[PDB]
Amino acid sequence: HHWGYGKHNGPEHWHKDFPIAKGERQSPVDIDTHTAKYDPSLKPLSVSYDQATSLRILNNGAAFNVEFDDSQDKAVLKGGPLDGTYRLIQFHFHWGSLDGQGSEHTVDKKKYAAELHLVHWNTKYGDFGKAVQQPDGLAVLGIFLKVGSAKPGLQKVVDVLDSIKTKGKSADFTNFDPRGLLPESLDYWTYPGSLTHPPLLECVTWIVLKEPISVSSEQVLKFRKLNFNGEGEPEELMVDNWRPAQPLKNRQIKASFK
Ligand SMILES: [Zn+2]
Numbered sequence: 001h002h003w004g005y006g007k008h009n010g011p012e013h014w015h016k017d018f019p020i021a022k023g024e025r026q027s028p029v030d031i032d033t034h035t036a037k038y039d040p041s042l043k044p045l046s047v048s049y050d051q052a053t054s055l056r057i058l059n060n061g062a063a064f065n066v067e068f069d070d071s072q073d074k075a076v077l078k079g080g081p082l083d084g085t086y087r088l089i090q091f092h093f094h095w096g097s098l099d100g101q102g103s104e105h106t107v108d109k110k111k112y113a114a115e116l117h118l119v120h121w122n123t124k125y126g127d128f129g130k131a132v133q134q135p136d137g138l139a140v141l142g143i144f145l146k147v148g149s150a151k152p153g154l155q156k157v158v159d160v161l162d163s164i165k166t167k168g169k170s171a172d173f174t175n176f177d178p179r180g181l182l183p184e185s186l187d188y189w190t191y192p193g194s195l196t197h198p199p200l201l202e203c204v205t206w207i208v209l210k211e212p213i214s215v216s217s218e219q220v221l222k223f224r225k226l227n228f229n230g231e232g233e234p235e236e237l238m239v240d241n242w243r244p245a246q247p248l249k250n251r252q253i254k255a256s257f258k
Contacts, residue, residue, distance in 0.1 A: 003198050004062075004228065006236075011243045018198050025202045026246040027193030028104035031253055036189055038258040045186045045207065045256075046079035047141075047179075052088065054176040057160055061167035061228055062197055063092040063241050066157065066176065070121070070128070075178070077120045077139055080207055080256070081190045086120035086139040089128055091178060093117070094196075095223050097239035099147045104196050104242045105208055107144075112212060113220055114145040115242070116181060117196075135192070137203035143183065143213060150216035153180020158222050167230040183211035187257040196243045210257065 003009050003017065015021035052075035057066050067090045068075055075088040095114035096102030103112035118141040121131040131137035156176055163171045187210045194202040226238035 005241050014198060014200065018200050020194070020200050020202065023194065023200070023202055024249055025192050025194055025251060026200065027196050027204065027206060028106075028243060028245055029191065029193070029248050029251075029253070030106045030109055030245045031189055031208065033108050033255075036253045036255040039254040039256070042081055042190070042254060042256045043079045045077070045141075045188065047077055047182070047186070049075045049088070049177070049179050051075060052176075052178055054173050054178075056170050057157070057164060057173035058170035059164040059167055059226060059238075061230070063094065063238070064161070064164060064226065065090045065092045066173060066178075073123065077118075077141065080188065081205060081254070082139055083136070085123045087123055088118060088120050088178070091116060091118040091181075093145075093223065094242040095145075095220060095239065096242065097224065097237075099217070099220070101240070102242060103144055104245075105142055105144075105206075106245055112144040113147050114215070114223070116143040116145060116213075117141070118143070118178065118181075132195075132199075132201050132203045134203055136205060138195075139205045139207060142206060142208040143181065144209070145215050145220070146212045147217050147220060148214035150219055151181070151213055153177070154215055154219055158219050161222050161226060165225070165231075166227045166233075169231070181213065183209055183213050185209070185211045187211065187255075189253050189255050191248075191251055191253045 053069040103115040125131040228236045
């Protein structure tokens with residue numbers, strides 16, 4: 001049937017419906033810290049989220065998305081390896097059934113408990129739909145989550161998950177500040193890649209932060225209570241919604257730090 005993260009419709013099956021799954025710039029990838037090249041020409045990232053306007057949180061059957069108003073340059077990302085302004089449209093997470101797995105990207109083969117993806121689109125293309133059809137259409141900021149101390153700024157998200165337990169459910173989610181999810185340092189790695197879930201388009205400039213944020217065992221546990229299924233259908237817990245690392249092929253990972 002349609003794609004998912006199960007035994008019969010998982011990542012290993014995606015190529016049948018989406019041939020690009022075996023493409024030349026697929027994500028995620030393993031970041032080998034010793035092979036990454038320090039690039040002195042990489043500018044610091046510029047994250048301007050002070051005017052961000054969150055609108056809703058939704059369970060789309062693959063994860064839960066926090067959507068923002070992207071009709072104006074309210075929350076933008078620029079600098080780094082980017083040319084132009086990229087507007088934040090939504091953020092979501094990828095997590096595992098156990099604390100030892102869950103992230104999509106890995107660092108020297110190390111897996112994290114979860115991975116946060118803040119998705120931005122290049123304003124020169126007018127809208128998200130047009131942007132995904134361009135090689136420099138999207139900029140995704142990836143942040144690793146490790147289990148340890150609780151992250152205060154994440155609790156607002158955790159507490160509303162009960163309201164969107166099943167696929168298709170959404171809830172008003174206003175005044176959420178994404179700055180509360182950022183680590184102290186903005187040092188990063190960057191490489192050209194793709195969406196990590198269908199349609200797997202190769203339109204993403206990945207920016208993966210080196211510093212993970214810590215979340216409590218209790219906070220991640222609540223993520224694991226969500227359902228892939230819709231209301232009224234057999235319960236399938238939403239866990240392990242991550243794609244395994246793909247071949248780097250002819251690509252180089254650059255680092256903003258040495
Ligand atoms: Zn993602």
